[PDB]
Symmetry: D2
Amino acid sequence: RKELAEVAYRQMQELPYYNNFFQCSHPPAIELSRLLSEVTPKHMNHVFFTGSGSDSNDTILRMVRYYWKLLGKPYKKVVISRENAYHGSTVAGASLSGMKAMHAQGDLPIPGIEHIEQPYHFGRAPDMDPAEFGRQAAQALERKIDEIGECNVAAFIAEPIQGAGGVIIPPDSYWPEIKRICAERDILLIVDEVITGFGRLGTWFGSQYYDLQPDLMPIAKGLSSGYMPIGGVMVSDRVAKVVIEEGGEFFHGYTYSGHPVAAAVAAENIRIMRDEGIIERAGAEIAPYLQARWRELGEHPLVGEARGVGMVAALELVKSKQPLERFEEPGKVGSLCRDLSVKNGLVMRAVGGTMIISPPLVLSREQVDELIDKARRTLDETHKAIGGALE
Amino acid sequence: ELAEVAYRQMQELPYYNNFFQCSHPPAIELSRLLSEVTPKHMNHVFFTGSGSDSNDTILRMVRYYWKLLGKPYKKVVISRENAYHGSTVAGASLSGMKAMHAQGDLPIPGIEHIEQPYHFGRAPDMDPAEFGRQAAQALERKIDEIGECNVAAFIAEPIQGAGGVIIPPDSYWPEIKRICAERDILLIVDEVITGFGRLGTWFGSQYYDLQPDLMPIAKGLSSGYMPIGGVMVSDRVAKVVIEEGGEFFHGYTYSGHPVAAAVAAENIRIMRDEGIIERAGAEIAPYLQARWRELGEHPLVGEARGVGMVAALELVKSKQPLERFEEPGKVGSLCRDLSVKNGLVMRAVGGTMIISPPLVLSREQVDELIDKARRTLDETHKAIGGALE
Amino acid sequence: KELAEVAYRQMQELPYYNNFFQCSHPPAIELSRLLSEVTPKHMNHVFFTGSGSDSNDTILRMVRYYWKLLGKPYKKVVISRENAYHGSTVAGASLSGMKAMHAQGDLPIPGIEHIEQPYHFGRAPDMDPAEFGRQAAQALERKIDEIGECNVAAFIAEPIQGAGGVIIPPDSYWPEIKRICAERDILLIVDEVITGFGRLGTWFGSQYYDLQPDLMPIAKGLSSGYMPIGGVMVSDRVAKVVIEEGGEFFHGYTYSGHPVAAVAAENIRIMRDEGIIERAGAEIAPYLQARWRELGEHPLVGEARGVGMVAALELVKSKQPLERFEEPGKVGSLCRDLSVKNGLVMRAVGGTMIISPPLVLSREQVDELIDKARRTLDETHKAIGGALE
Amino acid sequence: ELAEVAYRQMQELPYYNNFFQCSHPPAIELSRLLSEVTPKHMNHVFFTGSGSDSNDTILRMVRYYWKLLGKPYKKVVISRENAYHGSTVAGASLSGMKAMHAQGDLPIPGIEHIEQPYHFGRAPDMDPAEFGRQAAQALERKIDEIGECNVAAFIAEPIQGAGGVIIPPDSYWPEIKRICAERDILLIVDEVITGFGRLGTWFGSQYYDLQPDLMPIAKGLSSGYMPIGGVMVSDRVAKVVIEEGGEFFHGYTYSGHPVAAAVAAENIRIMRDEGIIERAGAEIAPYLQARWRELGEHPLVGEARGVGMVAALELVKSKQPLERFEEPGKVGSLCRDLSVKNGLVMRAVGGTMIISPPLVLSREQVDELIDKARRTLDETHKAIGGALE
């Protein structure tokens, strides 16, 4: 999560370090380090602090469920996720994510989790146009609910784009469908802003870009641009008018939670992410330069895909582009290209054969072309150590 | 004064380091490199963000450890009633607090609880050497119910900080040592709270002399200044996890946080040099015990107990005749504010008054908080005794 | 006197050793399994088994396969009632709301639970029955709401729990249950093994209480105790679906059961012509009821309930103040004996004396058991009148 | 001719054995006072309705056993895939035959499966001695996967008749007893089909020489002529269940059905004195096996296996190359009418022709079924001669 938890500045920016008032709660004598703002998606005006997006996802589940329990349905209790999707490392987070190394047959998905098709087009959609394999994938949802029990089901999770497993930007019509089905069946909606978070793309959160209107959302990293461990959980007023108009087991966080020192920070991080307007140099100014400069796989046979939006991007290491192929072991040519990316003058990752980039937001127009000819020199390069190599 | 230990304020730590985000690449100043102080047969260490994330991850390990030996059916762990071990779903299911588990969602599968050694509220007049056993043996009666081939460990705070105090009689932890081996299981001890000079020795384990194989630390690691969670390991558990690891081959070497680290990294470095660990249990603690053993003739104080650098006492109706209020907490907390609004830091679960002072405390300071609460114990005596009880 | 058998006490010659006892696979021999539609209203198919146990067991896989082809493989769980006997098959022990068969957690199995019984004499002391019938009926709505209308698939229950002693619901009970199996849109299976074939004033107990179940199972009463055989009847609703794309239960309707069990194929016909249920229902039953309903002046009897061809009465220490003994069971079974040894065949679930006589019974044969039981009342009334009981 | 065992038809029996249904009160002619013919260490039995309801009461008892030893967790039982262990939700779950489970309502919690020793449906090339070893060890690999103290029993017909006749090779069953004696579990074998009166002895348990701790019987007890189910028990399992009893304290004082017991009683008292079994396994058997083994040069058959009184054989499309059809059953069943429309009785599980004749078979009759079977095979062979199949 290097350069992806960091969501604003490279280095050398200074901050209201050491508050020196670090414990919490209790009668007077403080300075109030947790009175933060709402550049939030329009209808969200409460939130809940924790130790991480991993210590975040753990509490959403007691949330979504306490909710439906106090409305009369101690059964609307399951939640739906997707395969190959990162959703935190907390055993909850593990149950929530459809990665194969968390579950490992037993242990997880603990009671109350199962996973649906994830909209990965280059490798789960042969030639279908994009507008439908986002519909298909979106309806794959409704299948799982009529295959479970609406009065069993409680909400649906999803990062706006699956980062941590190779960018799975959704075909444009995925989110629009998902919008109806949450209204036709009437359940809840939580989005994971641990990644994406405070900018990383066109707008602030992934909500307003893709417009969606989540009942809840965690934010964690990027709140401090990696600078601090702070776990966030923003709620919607519906969800809120239930846990709070009827509660007592959750009248303590909104009374006190989180750590003053990690908060007192992000206040400036957002308060300095605002004015200077990176959010606007990032979306109306510097990003249409990354994507027009990215996606230029041009004539790189190893690349058969090249994608991205806003401030993140990726592309897939194939063997050939006539047949849209992958290597027999999709991961040897990827895991041996990272080093050829870090050992040449640029930082990049690759969940398998998918070189993934996620750079921060102060970037200018001149430090862009660099990680173009840096990777173009790492991409024309890994095109001789795998061909010379027999694979 | 609980999450923190030893350093109220005025102390300067390596703050603004301004090299902060490091996951794989060099820990700039290697901030993740700390010290195996007095863990002993515990020489490796795993980082998180808080204890809630520690006790969370401490379960994926056990269930991973055993399965590599051939026993994917040894999974269920066991805890204790009124014992806190986090607030994350693994931790909320592990802790013995009923006001978090509601209609199935907690406890998760592979969790159950046992009879907690609360001799005050659970033991009439039985000799502590006895109650220590039956509440210890209350474990063995929970393993045969399930099967020594289904159990995968037993956790426990050395003493329950978050459920008042709950000292185990001397005879408790002695037995536990026997059962945990007679049935071949692992012992993780909750250290987050008792950790770090909060008792007489470094960790709460050395006092009671046990040799756990995983402990979770947090808060105490930096005396409250920074969020972080820690998880410890035995030369054992580690060897096997690494013998044929994989998913976990990425922590002891690239985990935790570069900033919070160096801070705590300063926190302990100064607890050593300045020898607070030594001023706390050897010099001052006994005065604290010796002087907190003073319930005397307060019809409200009937129990008085303490170990190292922490203590408590219970509120009642009548001292000699066994009797307690008709709803402690309607009378305890109403004494909590009577300690702060008089001049002393004191939480109240509702009737078991507590004291969690830092390690730099001084005799005079000892004397100081005594009369101040005697005033608060002279006062609340008629505040609620003056009423119709 | 005796259950399972519902017709002819002894010496009635059926069509025995018909031999040719092969069925099903080859062309049939003489059509053993072809039985009458003698008043099930709209139920027009049937499935066969070996006994009540081996019957209800097959109603689950059916029910749960019903919704499984309407598009809701999750209406899988079913409800039943306490102090009810629905077989000794494992699902028959789970469906039966009796604790003495629920072995551990293995019994009851997933997808079953239990609700209040309309036992107006043990659950209700003086409450108005109608409301007691309404609530204990409303106790279902609660459970479904306690489980989830899209989790529940149906509900079973005995027209009168002959196994739970005898538990006639208040007149307002079932009329409300009719509504709820629609309010939540679900099925309704009734158990007629005991109540089936007379036993009540009508044929089944459905017809008496006026209802329309989706399936019902019968046994014993079919062969009047003469042959092992179990029947599981079905509605023209549930049917159309199973055959609309059959495959798993297109097997029995076309062929299942047992030839020689067609014995009952004459147990009903010879129950039809002679008009036994006829005279049984309209002629002899009303005589019996008003007469058995005569606790009169018997400090042992204070409840007196009877229906169709079946009744009971609870035994009591003192009825001026409604009472039971200090051990209902140490004394009740001390009278059944005092019935047979005195000359009448009664059973006692513990203090609730029972009777279920075959349907051929006559008028003059009514008074005979009466004084005789009375002769067992006055006796048992005073034998323990001298003890320390 | 599967369920039934001896006496093709026309043999008369003590039918009309009076007409009763007794239990607690006195009885006539004793009733269900049957015999003990070569079970050996078995001297008890629990009478049942059908082999479905038989294999269902061997499970509560199974667990009720380990319960009363103090192991409430030894709940599990291990079966074998493609095995017919009843239709009762226990029998259908225990049975390793998919199509009975339905993915949701079965398998009930607490049942998994292993591999079946199908030497020619899988592993026709490995030396039989080893495929028996692995096929046996296949049990340990799932007990080292569950919990040697979670597991509670292994259920295996001597041979899977419903699945054809997949006779376990020689080395399979020796290890099974070694293993069953190692990990501390019981042994339960379904002698319903196989045993009672087929094979080379009464029950097959005497042929393979194993010491079953539990045994169901049914069907062939009456040679079909009545519905009956039986649960034979081991003095081991015995000294235990009745000591407390509970759900089995008295059942042996009365159960079953007087009439289905009076019948079979003769079926055993007559199968002895007429020496059916004796001639069955000594004289009339080895001539049959010697002759069914004659797949000779039939391109359709590739193996000819059988043992005692029962056999079958595999159909294919080439032999030297053992190639099986692209969808056996589009061709197996198509050879089943080709024996009824010629004059002999065979079932086909999908491509395997099973033969299940009775014990009163004669030599001239043996020779009959042979040339008449060959007429079929030689009839069944011309019908494809290289279709597009």
